[PDB]
């Protein structure tokens with residue numbers, strides 16, 4: 001089944017969601033050519049721990065050694081911060097954050113383009129965010145998650161890109177990952193009708209090339225099989241009576257926090 005968050009739990013989710021979003025707004029100025037992903041991770045952890053007085057849900061997760069996941073270019077997800085990995089002009093980088101505050105999780109990620117952007121990098125990032133946005137605009141009571149996944153896939157493929165099938169969005173609350181699973185493509189296995197109070201994430205992973213991926217021998221890093229670029233954006237939301245409310249909205253987002261479908 002699915003969990004319906006109480007008004008009180010939703011407020012706690014707003015707090016946690018805001019903190020997760022603020023980690024991304026905070027790190028922005030540091031995402032420069034020459035900086036190491038290891039350094040970015042330390043900055044994020046110190047901020048989460050010393051200033052937000054929260055905890056990273058990534059640290060120790062199944063043995064994961066870092067506080068955030070940082071994925072560059074062909075890396076699809078779960079990139080491990082490393083002091084030896086330096087960002088450079090043209091890189092597209094995803095920093096994925098999940099913090100726990102007052103028992104609840106806030107989960108969000110965004111793409112950052114390093115220094116001088118490349119046209120293809122900007123396009124992939126733009127389309128990926130647009131696929132997340134179109135999905136968010138569909139969220140409202142009564143709609144099926146399958147319809148949303150199908151819409152994301154149709155949009156992405158029309159642009160000549162592909163959607164990663166191995167990973168998905170998910171319910172969230174006192175648990176990092178809870179039911180339901182939010183696939184970003186059409187699937188006969190998906191039959192979930194939304195209800196007010198449900199909290200979950202939408203986080204499509206889009207490849208510029210083919211959908212196939214590969215996991216590295218370090219046990220964490222996932223890359224595109226064809227080494228093409230891959231991008232991802234993620235937001236945590238709560239379903240409302242006439243639409244949804246984005247809990248991890250940032251100043252740079254260009255979609256309303258509260259989306260309504262009523263007249």
Ligand SMILES: O=C(O)c1ccc(Cc2ccccc2Cl)o1
Pocket residue numbers: 057058059061064069078096107170177203220234
């Ligand atoms: O956004 C998510 O749901 C998400 C990102 C990363 C994870 C789980 C994970 C896998 C491999 C290494 C570290 C982590 Cl936190 O879950």
Ligand SMILES: [Mn+2]
Pocket residue numbers: 096097098107108109234
């Ligand atoms: Mn995440």
Ligand SMILES: [Mn+2]
Pocket residue numbers: 107169170201203234
């Ligand atoms: Mn997530």
Ligand code: NA
Pocket residue numbers: 071072073074075076077092094229230231
């Ligand atoms: Na990438």
